[PDB]
DNA sequence: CTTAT
DNA sequence: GGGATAAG
DNA sequence: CTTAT
DNA sequence: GGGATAAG
């Protein structure tokens, strides 16, 4: 099956990802920024007990580490943690947004290619390491002491663009080696298109092999493999329509 | 004095005006209009007693007359009567607004003419008769029976423009007979300008003579006669400035 | 008094 | 959207 | 919890 | 202008 033949490529079997070819990211601050330290508003026991097993799993995975930082932003009770990074985002230098909008992205899908595979990458931002100099930016309090992220965090304003650019670099060779395949990238949402079912099969095997090798992980549960009709970015792609 | 020499021209001495050269005005309705009859909301005794001597004076002057009309609009308690003519105005055909705005009107005052007389005409709209066919438009209730206006009423949307146009017709000959005078008309607010005090004096006498003869009446109390500096349309005209 | 802004 | 406001 | 719309 | 709302 597709699962057993690519155990490294699937999140279900290959473990948490880590983009091994990507240098740990340095996050430049705006020219005038200084650290901001916001007090953690006290969390109810109910919310703390809800968040706790997630924090422990992230610590075990090395995605969170203890630290002491002049930066601090609060965790919200939503349970699983959401960080209010708005004051950090204001202090980080802006980058040009290079993620295309889905409508324009789908224009690059010609009617000759009608065999589709759709993959979504699991915990995509966590696959990108943060440089130790930038890790303290994202610190928060956990009860006492601070923790921070060693990977690109949720809620950081530049994570979608940085991830899209990183995966484009890592898949550039795949594109060159398979010039007859169409590969659309929308951050962690991927579409591969081919002319024949065989070509889609061969291309999907190469893409999964490459993704796992690079340290990314796709969701086996949600994968749509070598279908004539798939759901991608909120569209139903059928008959070459939409 | 200016008062004693022109007893017909001043409202204080000449009685209520009546523009004897102007045909009674016919007020055209919009193509689809039918009469509207709005119930008089009951008025307090205090407001009725306040309004009463004004109604009696207007009846004595012939400016109000009894009538029966399919039109009716309410009187408001403000005492002296104000009519809510909004539903009548909506049903009357629009006319082009030809009254100039004061800023543009004052542009026509050259620096050569710096001797000024300012007159304001008293009860100006009441000087214009309404044709009997149009009188029922403006009916209201007075306690029981209806009254209506035999002269152009306050609150009617076209009264300023119709009055301005009427007085322009009545003063056209005055302008031709005094080509060296500047005469600005803003509805009932008049400015006469001349080069010398004598010319202003002579021109003011001719203008008052003509106004009284035509049936208009100026306020002696407010008249500014042959001054180098006057208040007109909210401006202070001094040094040829403003 | 109701009604446009 | 509504109540404070100005105006007929 | 705070805060932009 | 403020309270209901969505989002970090």
Swiss-Prot record, chains A, B:
Its cofactor is Mn(2+); Mg(2+). Disulfide bonds: none annotated. Residues 59-237 form the Reverse transcriptase domain. Mg(2+) 1 binds at residues 120, 188-189. RNA binds at residues 41, 84, 86, 100, 158, 160. Binds 2 Mn(2+)/Mg(2+) ions for ribonuclease H (RNase H) activity. It comes from the Viruses. The reverse transcriptase is a monomer (Potential). Interacts (via RNase domains) with host release factor ETF1; this interaction is essential for translational readthrough of amber codon between viral gag and pol genes, as well as for viral replication. RT is a multifunctional enzyme that converts the viral dimeric RNA genome into dsDNA in the cytoplasm, shortly after virus entry into the cell. This enzyme displays a DNA polymerase activity that can copy either DNA or RNA templates, and a ribonuclease H (RNase H) activity that cleaves the RNA strand of RNA-DNA heteroduplexes in a partially processive 3' to 5' endonucleasic mode. Conversion of viral genomic RNA into dsDNA requires many steps. A tRNA binds to the primer-binding site (PBS) situated at the 5' end of the viral RNA. The reverse transcriptase is an error-prone enzyme that lacks a proof-reading function. High mutations rate is a direct consequence of this characteristic. RT also displays frequent template switching leading to high recombination rate. Recombination mostly occurs between homologous regions of the two copackaged RNA genomes. If these two RNA molecules derive from different viral strains, reverse transcription will give rise to highly recombinated proviral DNAs. This is Reverse transcriptase/ribonuclease H. The lineage of its organism: Viruses, Riboviria, Pararnavirae, Artverviricota, Revtraviricetes. The chain holds residues 683 to 937 of 1738 of the full protein.
